[PDB]
Design a protein around this motif. Structure first.
Motif, PDB file in Angstrom:
ATOM      1  N   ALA A 182     -44.806  27.283-121.651  1.00 21.72           N
ATOM      2  CA  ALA A 182     -45.052  28.134-120.492  1.00 21.72           C
ATOM      3  C   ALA A 182     -45.814  29.396-120.859  1.00 21.72           C
ATOM      4  O   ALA A 182     -46.242  30.137-119.984  1.00 21.72           O
ATOM      5  N   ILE A 187     -50.221  27.632-117.039  1.00 27.80           N
ATOM      6  CA  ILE A 187     -48.913  27.018-116.888  1.00 27.80           C
ATOM      7  C   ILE A 187     -47.930  27.968-116.250  1.00 27.80           C
ATOM      8  O   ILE A 187     -47.326  28.812-116.915  1.00 27.80           O
ATOM      9  N   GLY A 188     -47.783  27.807-114.941  1.00 33.03           N
ATOM     10  CA  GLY A 188     -46.881  28.633-114.166  1.00 33.03           C
ATOM     11  C   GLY A 188     -45.524  27.972-114.100  1.00 33.03           C
ATOM     12  O   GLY A 188     -45.269  26.983-114.804  1.00 33.03           O
TER      13      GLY A 188
HETATM   14 MG   LIG Z   1     -46.725  31.022-117.814  1.00 35.07          MG
END
Ligand SMILES: [Mg+2]
Ligand SMILES: Nc1nc2c(ncn2[C@H]2C[C@H](O)[C@@H](COP(=O)(O)OP(=O)(O)OP(=O)(O)O)O2)c(=O)[nH]1
Ligand SMILES: [Mg+2]
Ligand SMILES: [Mg+2]
Ligand SMILES: [Mg+2]
Length: 342
Positions: A182, A187-188
DNA sequence: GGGGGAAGGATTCC
DNA sequence: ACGGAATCCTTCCCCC
């Protein structure tokens, strides 16, 4: 192979505000986007580190920041002023490389491959670059250096604030196994969560999943991207990004579903969008609305020709009527988005 | 079967 | 609970 130097200005808006009025330096500063519904309705664009220390940061409601730091200095966001200070700094970086990708209003990538040789030299160019900007604009920045854009960026996130860091080939390999998935750009939460369900808490973990499985869960694009990095093979080139959309979407004093109530904010939105289009002509228009339940709905149209303000004014009303017609909820934020320029 | 596009939305924070 | 903008995905279409 390729050496990349990434630059991200520090607490940018709040730092520009300090530059314009140094007396603020040392005090906690919060730049705000006052939505107008009431007193301090709205969110925090960003805060300087002094304030960021007590949880005051980008995204929280101003009112909440006020509760934590009642005596901090609160300033309205002035994007125009920061935008120019940004352009100037971008013009400096150009003196170090023609191969430049301006990611945002505060970060850009530079391909210094055929300009330097080996990281020890790259690191030096980094320091010059920092001291340079600090001299001209009195703006401190962080620099990250690595083999591809992504890692360059991460090195900077690791080095902030006012830092500089090099992630060499040996560390890239270590990070691939250590870096939390993450903490990878792009990359949420949505993607991270889905990722954990496949037991992929690290980049390397992706190298042990049928590609078909990945694709199915997070999409081909995101999967190729990730496997690519893990494989120590990610290598997207550094290219100038070109504006493709221009728009504005404002908040109304009170939610509504009344056309004669909404229209004014919409027309206001179209006006600013056009002064911003400058000499550009869009063939596509999209009316966007944020319902009372913070959901986002949109309606648009693409014409076989460019769109005149008259056409946009008229066409947006229809799209706005389509939305109210097709969605039962009240509208909270209304606006327009123009695209497909000629 | 599948190219090509337009539309509405999801996801990111670049 | 602000808000500018890119990229990508799903669905629907028209058509050869
Ligand atoms: Mg993130
Ligand atoms: N209006 C608004 N501005 C934001 C938001 N998020 C970030 N920004 C602005 C404020 C920052 O000056 C500019 C660059 O953001 P960054 O995420 O790179 O962080 P910033 O440089 O602000 O602080 P940093 O020292 O890098 O941690 O983007 C937001 O949600 N709304
Ligand atoms: Mg920054
Ligand atoms: Mg940034
Ligand atoms: Mg950020």
């Amino acid at each position: 192979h390729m050496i990349v130097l990434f630059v991200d200005f520090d607490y940018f808006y709040a730092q520009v505000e300090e530059v314009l009025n140094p007396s603020l330096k040392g005090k906690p500063v919060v730049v705000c986007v006052f939505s107008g519904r009431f007193e301090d309705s709205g969110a925090v664009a960003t805060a300087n580190y002094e304030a960021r220390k007590f949880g005051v940061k980008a995204g929280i409601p101003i009112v909440e920041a006020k509760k934590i730091l009642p005596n901090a200095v609160y300033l309205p966001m002035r994007k125009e002023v920061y935008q120019q200070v940004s352009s100037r700094i971008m013009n400096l970086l150009r003196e170090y490389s023609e191969k430049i990708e301006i990611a945002s209003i505060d970060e850009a990538y530079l391909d210094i491959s055929d300009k330097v040789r080996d990281y020890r030299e790259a690191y030096n160019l980094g320091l010059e670059i920092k001291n340079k900007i600090l001299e001209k604009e009195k703006i401190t920045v962080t620099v990250g250096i690595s083999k591809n854009k992504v890692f360059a960026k991460i090195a900077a996130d690791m080095a902030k604030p006012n830092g500089i860091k090099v992630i060499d080939d040996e560390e890239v390999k270590r990070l691939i196994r250590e870096l939390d998935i993450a903490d990878v750009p792009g990359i949420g939460n949505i993607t991270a969560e889905k990722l954990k369900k496949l037991g992929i808490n690290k980049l390397v973990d992706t190298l042990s999943i049928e590609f078909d499985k990945l694709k199915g869960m997070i999409g081909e694009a995101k999967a190729k991207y990730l496997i690519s990095l893990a494989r120590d093979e990610y290598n997207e080139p550094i290219r100038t990004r070109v504006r493709k959309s221009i728009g504005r979407i404002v908040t109304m004093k009170r939610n509504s579903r009344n056309l004669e109530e909404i229209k004014p904010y919409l027309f206001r939105a179209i006006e600013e969008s056009y002064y911003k289009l400058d000499k550009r002509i869009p063939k596509a228009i999209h009316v966007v609305a944020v319902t009372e339940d913070l959901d986002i709905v949109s309606r648009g149209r693409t014409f076989p020709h460019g769109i005149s303000k008259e056409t946009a004014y008229s066409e947006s009303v229809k799209l706005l009527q389509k939305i109210l017609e097709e969605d039962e909820r009240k509208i909270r934020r209304i606006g327009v988005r123009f695209s497909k320029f000629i």
